[PDB]
Design a protein around this ligand. Structure first.
Ligand SMILES: CC(=O)N[C@@H]1[C@@H](O)[C@H](O[C@@H]2O[C@H](CO)[C@H](O)[C@H](O[C@H]3O[C@H](CO)[C@H](O)[C@H](O)[C@H]3NC(C)=O)[C@H]2O[C@@H]2O[C@@H](C)[C@@H](O)[C@@H](O)[C@@H]2O)[C@@H](CO)O[C@H]1O
Length: 163
């Protein structure tokens, strides 16, 4: 079987640059969040298949917020990447990952957070937001693995095919 660095228990930490944090939730809802503390608060949420547009509640950046989610796939799970741009602002939707595998991943590099998006088995790191703060903390509600950038091909493989 595949051998990855992990699983690590859920925590809040200063994710080192140039590592994929491959997150492996078992529960729907909030999966992970991060912030540069200045103009980006980002969060991913997991939605099960066959969900008509609806408003659910999540605790993001400490606050209970109401966000519209949907997933019109009868079979694929959907991670949604939400971002707010100021401390007191509202979250907007920026990217999604539709997947049979229930894994998502992001990386801090080049002052950005890269994110796997698309539809498995063809998800790719096509999306990023800009944070310009290498010491940005990430909070994770799920177990996760760390994959160095040299093994990006393996991260892509796991996102798309599972472990
Ligand atoms: C459907 C589709 O193909 N859309 C493409 C856009 O996604 C592309 O826009 C850029 O996409 C990037 C991710 O792949 C990234 O999100 C980027 O914005 C981010 O990076 C810039 C600097 O490079 C800024 O710092 C932004 O603030 C940052 N976004 C966040 C939320 O932090 C996108 O670039 C922005 O959007 C594009 C369209 C231009 O208007 C830029 O001036 C913006 O900065 C892009 C293709 O690469 O166009 C679409 O086709």
């Amino acid at each position: 079987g595949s051998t990855l660095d992990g699983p690590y228990q859920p925590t809040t930490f200063n994710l080192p640059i140039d590592y994929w944090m491959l997150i492996a939730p078992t529960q729907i809802g909030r999966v992970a969040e991060g912030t540069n503390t200045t103009d980006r608060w980002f969060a991913c949420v997991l939605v099960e298949p066959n969900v008509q547009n609806t408003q659910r509640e999540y605790v993001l950046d400490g606050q209970t917020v109401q966000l519209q989610v949907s997933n019109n796939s009868s079979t694929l799970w959907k991670f949604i990447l939400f971002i707010k741009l100021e401390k007191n602002g509202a979250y907007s939707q920026y990217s999604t990952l539709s997947t049979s595998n229930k894994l998502c991943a992001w990386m801090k590099r080049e002052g950005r957070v890269y994110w796997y998006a698309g539809t498995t088995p063809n998800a790719s790191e096509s999306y990023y937001l800009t944070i310009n703060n290498d010491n940005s903390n990430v909070s994770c509600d799920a177990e996760f693995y760390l994959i160095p950038r040299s093994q990006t091909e393996l991260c892509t493989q796991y996102i798309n095919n599972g472990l």
